[PDB]
């Protein structure tokens, strides 16, 4: 689990939306698995404007935080879940590391900001949904 919070927007997993987020949609879009949804409150968090490919991010699994060297955000096969049928997510970038279910929603960071949130996992890699190409978060 986890969440963006940035300006009146709240950034989450499209798969782990809640009936509040769905409530107060501003935009989604499956093949990203991304969900955003207003606030009333103000964020805590900034988003990275940059093209980074070295990052931290939060792995739950581990209550740590792990250094990661990712690909440039792409058009990458997911296999069939719960949440969705087999298909391609795109704006997908993956990293060496550990990310197991219930790892979705941790942050990954570059030294500008926030550049997306775990969205995929297994075989000792680790997918972030990017989120860096969504100018509007900041207006
Ligand atoms: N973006 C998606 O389509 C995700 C939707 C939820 C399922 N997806 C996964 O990768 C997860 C998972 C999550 C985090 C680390 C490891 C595994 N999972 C694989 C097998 C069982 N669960 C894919
Ligand atoms: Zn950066």
Request: hydrophobic share 35%; charged share 20%.
């Given at each position: 689990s986890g969440?963006?919070?940035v300006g009146?927007?709240?950034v989450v997993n499209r798969?782990?939306?809640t009936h509040n987020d769905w409530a107060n949609l501003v935009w989604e879009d499956s093949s990203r698995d991304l969900l955003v949804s207003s606030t009333t409150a103000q964020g805590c968090d900034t988003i990275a404007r940059c093209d980074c490919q070295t990052g931290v991010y939060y792995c739950s699994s581990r209550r740590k935080h792990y250094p990661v060297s990712f690909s440039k955000?792409?058009?990458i096969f997911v296999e069939?879940?719960?949440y969705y049928p087999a298909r391609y997510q795109?704006?997908?970038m993956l990293a060496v590391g550990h990310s197991e279910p219930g790892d979705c929603g941790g942050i990954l960071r570059?030294?500008?900001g926030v550049v997306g949130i775990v969205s995929t996992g297994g075989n000792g890699l680790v997918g972030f949904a990017d989120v860096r190409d969504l100018l509007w978060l900041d207006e």
């Amino acid at each position: 689990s986890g969440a963006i919070y940035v300006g009146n927007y709240r950034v989450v997993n499209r798969h782990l939306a809640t009936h509040n987020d769905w409530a107060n949609l501003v935009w989604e879009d499956s093949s990203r698995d991304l969900l955003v949804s207003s606030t009333t409150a103000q964020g805590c968090d900034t988003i990275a404007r940059c093209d980074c490919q070295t990052g931290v991010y939060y792995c739950s699994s581990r209550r740590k935080h792990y250094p990661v060297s990712f690909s440039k955000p792409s058009l990458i096969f997911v296999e069939a879940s719960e949440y969705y049928p087999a298909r391609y997510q795109s704006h997908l970038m993956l990293a060496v590391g550990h990310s197991e279910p219930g790892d979705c929603g941790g942050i990954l960071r570059c030294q500008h900001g926030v550049v997306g949130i775990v969205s995929t996992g297994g075989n000792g890699l680790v997918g972030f949904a990017d989120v860096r190409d969504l100018l509007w978060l900041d207006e």
